Symmetry: C7
Subunit: 261 residues, 7 copies
């Protein structure tokens, strides 16, 4: 009938029972509070139940191994296996968390905004919204593309509508017999007659290369980002009309045939 | 005949025996409960037996090293090797768990739904269902494709049927001798006569480029996503018929041959 | 001649000797049991000996460092190096364990079965069996391909024989002079006369595009997965025969030569 | 009515209550200070609230598990799960932190500066600014590109405007009948007559290869980085004019046709 | 002149000296035993000396930090740095250990054997032997290729000689004017006259496609894996001879030239 | 009024206050010393301030948690979160540290030196200097390329100027009618007449292949690395001149036209 | 004036002072020994100084935190940060250590030797030496390539000179009108007349395919690895000479032109 060690053992076992009971009731309270909060807002039944079950099971495991440790059973192996499971689930959630962090960065720094034409890794379209995990944009064709934010933060972000002024690049191919001065002066007159082409920017009309069947002139003109395509179409049509009127010919693929026998 | 230290040693050895016995019976109870639950639902015999064997062996290892620690043998090396094995199995299950997390995200955010035409990384087809690990979709050809959810969350998710209105893009190539005004007016009449082409959207009929053997006109018209292909086919057939009737010719690959000798 | 501390030291050294002796005999018993079990079933001599040697050496190392700890020599460095070795071997076995987990998933969810034509990442063939580490399939050519299960779970799994009905796609190219109505009516008659083409599915016969040297008609017809190739061959042969009989010509690569000098 | 152990237990419980109360008030003070600092500067409401909530919850968790440890409940499992969560969030923030470190390196070593034409992994444009996470540059076309700093530090950094002098490379293709000496002397005269071509650098005019339809001469001349394109255009135009005047012909694609029947 | 604490300090210092002396002599004994074993078998001098030096230095470090811990100096930092070094060397040896594990798997499951023609990731040749780290195979050209076992376990393993029967695929292109029935009957007679072509397998002779300049027939016949190439050559030669005798012509690349001017 | 435990508590609290005060003053001294050292050399203000702030905050956190531990509050959670942050920052700095280690290796082993023409992963140019993080080289075009040292250590390092002697490879294509003996003897005479071509090395003049329109001779000659390009140009020019003088013709792309109708 | 606890505190502080003094002197001795050893052999000044500084700073940090622990300040945070730094530097040195391990494996197993022609991942050349970190080989062109050993162990190692006998593969294309028997007998006579072609190996002369403009014969002959190229050149030249003498023609690209208008 020991009085010191037996009393210590009784204190330990009563403390372990109190620990497990308090852990059970605290897990119940936490689960009830989480269920109340998930009821207070929009949530999915299956995911909410899975999350509450995982939280409750985690708390129950914590209090059970705490009670075992208070009793005197070593729980280092259980802690190691729990750490392994936590590392596995962290590696599993690495992709989702990286997308979330990238979305936070995109919201903060604002590389692009809603209604702003962009090019995120080869796909281009008007941005509609930037969610936490992925942005959604509508292409010029009309289809909706959802791009994860991690793949947006990684790689370049071309922004077409950030700069108010953009440049067109015409590549006109005329025959070798065509007069260089006449071609240059016709193209210069066409560029000057246009009103939506900015005159304070560079207006290049130069002979760019000597091709296989034609000499390729290059025309580079700057215009406001909203008139770029219309200017391109109008200038191309006027180039064709004036070249046809002036006798300048666009050559077909040339070929020299050395006839034998 | 010591009374304090010998009593402590006896308490320790009896506690170790109690720990190992209780561990054995608790492992038996847990295995029986898991077997009962797996019987209560659909399960595979081999996988169920492997899982129960792994769980029982884990519990037995836990209680054995707990008994060794209570006796006095250090078990830190066993715990380290068990942690290494847990890390190895976590890295092994990383892919499956990532697929599971991606499936949960796809169910929650609903980037696509059943019966919705999509394009998940180059493969396009009607989605049939979204499971926990992988979705299955039927392509237009009729074959079934199973895509892991991780590879769906990673990369773009093109959704063709999300937007009710989509755009067609015709590229008509006519000869250089063809009249630009006549071609444009014929294409405009063809577009206007169509009823499934939305008139409140942009209807582009412009000269897009000067090709090697033809001048390429571009026609862009918007229509409801359900009439897109039929509108494309009807407009193409009418374009050919009206161009043949009006004398506009679609040129063959042109070539200028400079005859020598 | 101390009686307390000297007795404690004697107890510690005797306990260490008992620990090392019991570790040796337990390692011998475990090795004998493992050897008996490996004898009871099919096993390879070299791999079995290597595994038994590794297990015995691990147990011997465990009991040796346990004896050192009981004596009083700190073994934290040995435990750290053992953990490093365990992590290295876990990273080494990561690929094999990932293949094993993927094989378990493939057996459970059954994306494909034995005797089912599939396409696992670009290679297509009839599945023969699904082992734990890798499946083996015979291609239509007759060669056997062994694909690791991890590379099967990763990436798409196209299943040709899952859906009973599949679609053919004929691309017929006829000359520009050919009558569109006559071509369409001939193709429609050929499709209707076929009995293995399902009549309740869509039967598309439309002008698909205006090519460089021909107008490309598209024919899409559905049939049971077992008659797909035979239907394709029969329809193609009948298309050629009827086009030759009706005067419709398949054009050779066209070219316009503008003769000069 | 014990006086030693009961007093120790009372001290422990009072200390735990003091620990939790002081943790609560210190968390409140830290949150108030962080809120004051975020008010003192520009910040976003949602991100600021999320960061303050995370910091406060972390401090509350710390003080709660400290109080539990002071009471006597083992918290090793909670610490292991917290470490797993910290590792997961560290892996999530790995990309952003790598971009930040790369930005620091780019600011320090200055591989490129604002207003300096560069080529960062295939995209070339004038650098506008180098932020902490990503630099922004305007291409010659006029579009703005935002490149993450990690992808800039990785891979080559071509700098066009670092070196004051750059080299042009003309590839002139003349007919096989053309006189090599005459072609070389004409090209040499054209190069010598140019004033923006540096005369102290190498001026190569050599026959580079015998092509399929022409003999390709190579002209390499050095000029200041600001006159490179203008020199290229002027030299090309003068080359064409002088070759046309001197009778040297640029051959069309040659072909020998062996006529049969 | 304390008798308890001073005696404890003397015991600790004498124990530390004994620990370091025993560690030195045990390191000497282990090094001598390892040197004797390496002498007993084939070994390289430099690698053997490096391995023995590493083992001896590891044991010396272990016993030195054990002596420091017994003295009373904390060695947790040394243990942490040693763990970091162990993790670094484990990551370094990850590739070699993965190759070793893959070699063990290849030996066990036997995906291929010596003298068996295979295709390991694009390279094909007769397997000579499978070592622990890499297999060596001789290609049909005669060069020896050594493939690491990890890269063999990863990716497909095409085995040409596993299946006794393989299929040939002839693609014959004949002119559009050729009689389909005559071509099919000639090919069928050629296939039937062959003795090494299995008659119980499928023997396909069908019109496969309508090409640009020819109609492509397809012939598929099965034969034993040892007669595949000889059957291919003999059937091809007989096809050419019989088509030349029967008047069937293999067309040259066709072209329609629309002469103008 | 306890005298033992109360005195112990007073000692602990006074020790904690001393620890925090000494930590504060030591942090101040370390920050002052680091600031003095950064003043003594070139440094950037922002980076220096950030580094000093990080060091001071780290020391303050260390001494604060040390004071908490001395008081009696468990700090294992704080240590775990600090370890997670350290691992995150280590993964962030992994790329920079790998570049630094690669730079150290490049400086030590000297795979290339300043002023030595190299080819580091597809980009070739004269090396200017090798810094700690990245080398900079000037290409033959004149642009400066900065390559991170990690990407240099990874992958091949082609060194053009390491070997004093290099080989040219001429591919001459002559008509099928050309005399093989005459072509070989002319090429041999041209090679022999050259003085910068080493005569003790192999001088190959052989018929390499039968091409589609020409028979391709191969000429391989060795020369000093400084005369390689000049020898190539001179030999090519002499080859053309002597072939034109001797009647050997370089054929244009040949084509046999079988005229029909 | 306590006699027990005060004496213990004095012992602890004197022990801490002794620990720090002995750590300082041991660091000095180790640095002096390392400097002496680095003087005794070839070393670089900057790298040697950096390594000695790192070693001395590590030892100083170790002894400082040991003294702090002996005093009573908890150093777990310092140990955690030191472990994080060690992990970061281990990840940094992962590439270099992997190259070192691969070099050790290459030296041991000897996949290739000095003076042995190989192909290490697409680059082929004669191996000069195999260092610890990277091998260096001279290509047939004459340039020196340094390949890291890790990238050599990874991927295939084609060894051209391991097998004494290698096979040539001639692809001769003759006109469709050519006699198959005559072509085969001429090629067989040419192969038989050669003395460096092994007669005990297979000597294939078969019709390989029916090409677009020619029938392609295949000739496969084995020869010693040293005579392979000379045999190829001699056989090719004799093939051309005998085909020209016998009237067999090598056809130019054929084309059937269907003339219209
Ligand atoms: C795969 C990933 C792995 C990540 C790393 C995992 C490391 C896990 C380390 C676990 C350490 C547990 O730490 C230790 O646990 C045991 C319970 O088991 C606690 O308790 C133990 O010792 C105390 C000492 O007073 C005893 O009263 C108690 O009966 C006993 O169980 C210890 O007080 C604690 O220090
Ligand atoms: C490869 C991945 C590695 C991940 C990290 C792994 C770290 C492993 C650390 C294991 C720590 C074990 O922690 C320690 O274990 C021993 C048993 O061995 C326990 O027990 C030990 O010390 C107690 C002290 O009272 C003694 O009564 C007991 O006889 C003895 O065995 C300790 O109370 C516990 O603190
Ligand atoms: C590279 C991967 C690294 C992964 C992480 C590795 C962490 C390794 C941590 C090892 C911790 C060992 O934990 C500790 O070990 C020593 C033996 O060395 C044990 O024993 C030590 O302290 C006890 C205290 O009573 C003494 O009686 C004993 O003489 C002494 O050796 C401790 O009871 C245990 O707590
Ligand atoms: C997934 C990533 C994992 C990374 C690695 C994680 C390792 C986690 C190891 C946790 C170690 C905790 O360390 C241990 O914690 C317990 C509380 O639980 C503390 O406290 C415990 O033992 C002390 C001993 O005096 C008791 O008074 C106290 O009642 C008890 O709770 C110990 O003093 C401390 O040593
Ligand atoms: C970068 C990778 C990092 C991987 C993880 C590394 C974790 C390293 C943890 C080391 C833990 C060491 O564990 C601890 O070590 C010290 C020595 O330093 C031992 O010893 C210490 O405490 C004992 C307590 O009785 C004292 O007698 C002794 O004087 C003192 O040095 C402890 O008994 C042991 O518990
Ligand atoms: C995400 C990456 C994670 C990497 C791994 C991280 C592992 C972290 C393990 C921390 C271990 C801390 O180790 C433990 O800390 C507590 C403080 O908290 C110290 O102190 C604790 O126990 C001592 C025991 O005498 C008490 O006096 C003190 O009041 C108490 O706070 C312990 O003496 C020390 O052993």
């Amino acid at each position: 009938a020991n009085q010191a060690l037996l009393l210590s053992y009784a204190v330990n076992i009563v403390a372990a029972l109190a620990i497990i009971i308090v852990g059970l009731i605290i897990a119940r309270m936490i689960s009830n509070a989480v269920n109340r909060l998930m009821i207070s807002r929009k949530i999915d039944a299956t995911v909410a139940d899975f999350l509450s079950a995982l939280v409750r099971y985690g708390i129950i495991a914590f209090t059970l191994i705490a009670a075992l440790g208070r009793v005197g059973v070593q729980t280092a192996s259980v802690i190691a296996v729990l750490g392994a499971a936590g590392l596995a689930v962290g590696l599993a959630l690495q992709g989702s968390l990286s997308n979330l962090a990238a979305g936070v960065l995109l919201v903060m720094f604002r590389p692009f905004r809603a209604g702003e034409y962009v090019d995120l890794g080869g796909v281009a379209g008007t941005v509609l919204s930037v969610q936490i995990f992925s942005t959604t944009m509508r292409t010029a064709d009309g289809k909706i593309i959802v791009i994860p934010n991690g793949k947006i933060i990684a790689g370049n972000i071309i922004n077409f509508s950030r700069e108010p002024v953009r440049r067109n690049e015409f590549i006109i191919g005329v025959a070798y017999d065509s007069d260089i001065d006449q071609v240059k002066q016709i193209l210069t007159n066409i560029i000057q007659s246009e009103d939506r082409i900015l005159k304070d920017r560079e207006m290049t009309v130069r002979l760019n290369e000597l091709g296989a069947s034609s000499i390729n002139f290059v025309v580079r003109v700057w215009s406001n980002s909203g008139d770029l395509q219309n200017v391109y179409w109008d200038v191309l049509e006027r180039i064709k009309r004036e070249f046809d009127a002036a006798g300048i010919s666009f050559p077909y693929p040339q070929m020299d045939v050395n006839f034998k026998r």
